[PDB]
Design a protein around this nucleic acid. Structure first.
Lengths: 96, 98, 83, 109, 76, 111, 97, 99, 80
DNA sequence: TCGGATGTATATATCTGACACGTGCCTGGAGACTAGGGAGTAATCCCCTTGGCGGTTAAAACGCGGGGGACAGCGCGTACGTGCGTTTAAGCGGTGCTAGAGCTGTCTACGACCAATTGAGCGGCCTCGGCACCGGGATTCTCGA
DNA sequence: TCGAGAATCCCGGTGCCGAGGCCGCTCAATTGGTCGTAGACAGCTCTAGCACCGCTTAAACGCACGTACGCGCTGTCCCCCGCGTTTTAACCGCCAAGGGGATTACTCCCTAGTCTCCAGGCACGTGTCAGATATATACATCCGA
């Protein structure tokens, strides 16, 4: 008689919060707002990448499309830092 | 003989107090009744969830506050302190609404 | 039950409080009718879109998701109520 | 035999789920095929943005001598920064409020 | 009064009609001369549609005019 | 084993826009996993109706100016003079269009 | 000399124009404008229908989604007339075979 | 005596003439030079198709015309006839462009 | 390279006259030039980003249409 | 320029409901292997971009006289802010009841996929009529008097 | 009130270039048949949305009074507007040279699909402390003399 499973991003956001501020909590509504923000940004980036891949007559999306979409969407400093972070993550993953 | 404040002090006091808070301003039951009456015109015998009413109230209040801010700017632009309906009309016209 | 004359439920002190939060200091005597009309128009549009979204799903109860989708479709998205 | 499993997030050294992002990209009807590097990039970007927002909100909360984060702190953190406000210029946050400003003309002489 | 009526194929037909006459007799006469049943024809004079019940005199049509005929299958 | 004569899907529906092209574009446009057999007809009908409305208004506007061809000025005039069509294309600019001839009343000469 | 083929809505737009106005031409710039208009409207309607289908966890796009998207996008009178035309066309097509 | 018009008539004549026609109002070569100079700061040794420059010119002119109309409305609202920079600033602030 | 001065005063006067302005002050020109520069900067940056992703060297007219559309300023009649 | 009264900020007890954490478990993610097509790379064609020179003429630049508009100052009377006594209904705490949201089986009709083929739509040519352009006269406005 | 100049429009004749139509063909939309599963219909369960009643008290209403600001009127001073004269570079036409866009052929490798296995994330239950209330007190601030 248990209900179905609902997916969310609460665990990872809490992990990040404890990574940054080791002695701070968070309430329920803040968690809901963070979940909505993450989903909305994900949808924007994915849609832009899909459109960009469609324009060049291509049938797959790679890291290049994500990088270009990130450059297009975000403002300057955020775009630069995010590009550096994504490049670092990709090279670290491919190293192992 | 009774102590009275000059016209204007209480206005600034209220401005500060209501800018320091976050709670809603419009009453609940009249707003719910208005929402139900408005929604009647589209489909008879409808039912509402509470969260929908809360979201509607939040969005409406935010929109009204933003419109009032723009109206205050428009009124200030023309060497005036009191806001008038023509300021609201000008703000809505410039914003791009008919 | 049929409802009538409910727009007057938005009382003058409520509009005064909204203006005070908005930063206004002096208010004329003719603002309230314009505010009521603007609010009625906004609610009409949003509720129409939400009702259409509900009607597509063969349901009979309007949910918060429908209001969120209707608000998003007009470029004034909302955070804190799911989705 | 078979070896012990290690999550792709552990290989990438992240805190966000790579596999969930990959599944959402595959099932989201975005393209016919999905590369093997996109989820890592997307997870890194999302983690960076979340960390920045959370750090600003935590600083704002610690200013008000409170231990927990409420939507008011999120609104104050977002509206006080230029790029973050520009990114969310058409988003309203429930239970947020406004910024305490007053025009200089209305002040008493 | 003599009017030429054109089709989409450039096919021009001369027609003798009176100003007091109304267009139902005109479509009956083109049934007589062509046989196209009276439902798929649409007549345009200088970009305006013609109401069936109204007569030719009210339209102020002149001799040697140029009326256009289009055919809408509508079959389906 | 004699195949019957081919009849286009647009012919059966009594339309002018191509149903098959719309069906292919919907299938290859990455919109859904599968596409029903009735959507292209609906879409073609809607597009044809909108095109007919715009063309009728533009042709009238051209005819008022004693011309036998349609130029972007006529399309702009037809669009901007109808409230609903103006509402639809709210954030669209047309090349070689111009602006509607209006003047504020106060600026007019006195007396 | 090898030249790639390009697809456009020119002939259909010309057919509609000749159906409405028997004697009226058109230039190239107007043709391009009309082509862009048709493409934009098609893209908007298709995207709205796809999102609506995704909301209700269904994997097929039917005429119901198209009708709902048309009602959501266009203004009042245009929506009414478009719905009438679409339902008439669908009924006509279904009846014949 | 030489014949002179009162100040104001020629402005109205120019308004009618320039909003009856549909030609471009900025010379092509200076605009092309400005576009090239602006684009040079992002990538070196670039090349342009003419239609791209034409599209940029059309978009810029339409934007400027709309902004000027809104500025004129704002100027009229304050019981004036001449536009001033504060009117442009107020219009851009209310429109949501300027932060 | 002060090519911003190529947008001369009578050009701004003509644009304002088409817009419907009757009297113009003496300080509008600097504001107009600044606004035009900002708008062109944004649009050209977006177009150059598209071209760079395309792995080309000459910007076309079609990515300009994409850049304009991204900002909610759709343009008609240029092969869109 | 001082001094009284009001509103707001500060310190302390206390008690409650939401936050943080421990368990089971089951479904979704990870490891191993194939097979096939999407994309990277080299080579060729030629079209479209860039650069330079002469002229000529319309548009840009500069100067001047002056009339009309922007701005400051002044007077007044009415609408709006503030405080007080009275009336109204919003808010809270329970108790009933059932319509409708949500989940599970099943079974059938509807859409994807493949092989043959033929008529719709696109590229190249051309041909002539609608529209652009020049010269001329009739008309319609504006500004002294 | 009235009449002399300028600016604009309607008309007629002439030339050109691009729009509307004709051929030829190749690739994509039809037609016919098969097969797999997505969803439509029926049934059942349980939650939350609607309705009602009573009580309390905080908020909305109406009224009296004073004063500050919105609005009209007048005068000054100066700064854009209209017109004439001089300068310059935009535009059109023509002529060369070459870089980079656009296809085409070939091949290696990157990802989808399938099977087996197991551990991480979600729902459920529980304890305890962070903060919201209530009470009292000290300080900043406003208006009058």
């Amino acid at each position: 008689r248990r209900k179905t499973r609902k997916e969310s991003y609460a665990i990872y956001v809490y992990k990040v919060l404890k990574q940054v501020h080791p002695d701070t909590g968070i309430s329920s509504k803040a968690m809901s707002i963070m979940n909505s923000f993450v989903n909305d940004v994900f949808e924007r980036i994915a849609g832009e990448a899909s459109r960009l891949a469609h324009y060049n007559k291509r049938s797959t999306i790679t890291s290049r499309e994500i990088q270009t979409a990130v450059r297009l969407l975000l403002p300057g400093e955020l775009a630069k830092h995010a590009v550096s972070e994504g490049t670092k993550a990709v090279t670290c993953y491919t190293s192992a | 003989k009774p102590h009275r404040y000059r016209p204007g002090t209480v206005a600034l006091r209220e401005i500060r107090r209501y800018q320091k808070s976050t709670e809603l301003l419009i009453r609940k039951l009249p707003f719910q009744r208005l929402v139900r009456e408005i929604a009647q015109d589209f489909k008879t015998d409808l039912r509402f969830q509470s969260s929908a009413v809360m979201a509607l109230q939040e969005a409406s209040e935010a929109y009204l506050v933003a419109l009032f801010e723009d109206t205050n700017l428009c009124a200030i632009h023309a060497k005036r302190v009191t806001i008038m309906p023509k300021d609201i009309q000008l703000a809505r016209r410039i914003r791009g609404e008919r | 039950k049929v409802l009538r004359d409910n727009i007057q439920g938005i009382t003058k002190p409520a509009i005064r409080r909204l203006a005070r939060r908005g930063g206004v200091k002096r208010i004329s005597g003719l603002i309230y009718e314009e505010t009521r009309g603007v609010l009625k128009v906004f609610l009409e549009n949003v509720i129409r879109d939400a009702v259409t979204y509900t009607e597509h799903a063969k349901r009979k109860t309007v949910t918060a998701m429908d209001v969120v989708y209707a608000l998003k479709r007009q470029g004034r998205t909302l955070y804190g109520f799911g989705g | 035999t078979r070896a012990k499993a290690k999550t792709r997030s552990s290989r990438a050294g992240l805190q966000f789920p790579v596999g969930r992002v990959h599944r959402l990209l595959r099932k989201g009807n975005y393209a016919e095929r999905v590369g093997a590097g996109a989820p890592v990039y997307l997870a890194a970007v999302l983690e960076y943005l979340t960390a920045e927002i959370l750090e600003l909100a935590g600083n704002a909360a610690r200013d008000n001598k409170k231990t927990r984060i409420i939507p008011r702190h999120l609104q104050l953190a977002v509206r006080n920064d230029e790029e973050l406000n520009k990114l969310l210029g058409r988003v309203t946050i429930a239970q947020g409020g406004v910024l305490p400003n007053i025009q200089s003309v209305l002040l008493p002489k | 009064m003599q009017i030429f009526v054109k089709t989409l194929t450039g096919k021009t037909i001369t027609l003798e009609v009176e100003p007091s006459d109304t267009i139902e007799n005109v479509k009956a006469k083109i049934q007589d001369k062509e046989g196209i049943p009276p439902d798929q024809q649409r007549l345009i004079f200088a970009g305006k549609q013609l109401e069936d019940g109204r007569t030719l005199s009210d339209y102020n049509i002149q001799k040697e005019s140029t009326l256009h005929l289009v055919l809408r299958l509508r079959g389906c």
